[PDB]
Structure 1
Amino acid sequence: ALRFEALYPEGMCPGWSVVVKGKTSSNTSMFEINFLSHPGDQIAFHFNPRFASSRIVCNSFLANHWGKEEVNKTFPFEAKEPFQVEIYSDQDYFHIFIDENKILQYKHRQKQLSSITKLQILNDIEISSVEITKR
């Protein structure tokens, strides 16, 4: 279910950095980190580490359907072991860092950056910290 949500109406894109620390409960579940645009909560960016299969699916949900999946096969995560994820964004991409190592970048599909006012965290993650900072 939902583990955390934040709302910043002045827009957390571009230029804001989101740092999430925690660990998973099980070895075979999953969690996701979504950036939602206002109003109507389309998903500007969806970040979904899958531990049962050890891949990272990244996608967007605009206007009623997912787009093309962007997948990363090397899993920097490890079940029940603390991790750090940093998601940042500039004019052109979302930038991803795990345990301080850059893992991927994801080019904007939702072009209305200022509409991205929400953050939510779902399912199998025990949260120890969420930090949101302007860069």
Structure 2
Amino acid sequence: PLIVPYNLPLPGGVVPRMLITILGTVKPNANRIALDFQRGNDVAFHFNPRFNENNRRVIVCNTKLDNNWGREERQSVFPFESGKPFKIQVLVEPDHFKVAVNDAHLLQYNHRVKKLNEISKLGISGDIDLTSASYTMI
């Protein structure tokens, strides 16, 4: 329903209590997905499901500053399944992004980029059919 890669503007950046919801379906035989919360060219929060990294499924999270990736954070809980519909919810909290998939808490990612009100775009990329991408305040 939406064209991938998709850019969702986040007007005025993010703020605690802001909830971002992504609905879509993973393609058959998917290889990768990425969500990129961006501050200009920097990536404040990269959330990257990998379906086949050495025959393991893993989510890699990181930050990109001045074109350099930092220290990866890895989660081996892997809630996505090729061919199936999913919901990703990203709740901005004071100290971290809090991510739930299909209504189950998955991970938290501490804020490395601290100018939250400059994290003004979300890019959505990879091997999905994207149904919708939106935000609200809770």
- Change beyond 3 A, Cα 1:62–1:14: farther
- Distance in 1 (CA, whole Å) between partners of 2:85 and 2:113 is 31
Query: 1:6-85, aligned counterparts within 5 Å?
Result: 6-37=8-39, 40-52=40-52, 53-85=56-88
- Distance in 2 (CA, whole Å) between partners of 1:76 and 1:82 is 11
When the two chains are superposed, the root-mean-square deviation of aligned CA atoms in Å is 1.5
SS in 2 for 1:114: helix
Q: Structure 1: state its 5+ residue gaps.
A: none
2:112 equivalent to 1:109: yes
Q: CA deviation at 1:114?
A: 0.8
Q: CA deviation at 1:111?
A: 0.9
Structure 1 runs (4+) deviating above 2 angstroms are 12-15
CA contact (8 A) 1:13 1:116 kept: no
Amino acid at match of 2:15: C
Q: Structure 2: state its 5+ residue gaps.
A: none
**2:129 alignment counterpart:** 126
Equivalent pairs, count: 133
SS in 1 for 2:78: coil
State the TM-score, normalized to the length of structure 2. Answer: 0.89
**2:7 alignment counterpart:** 5
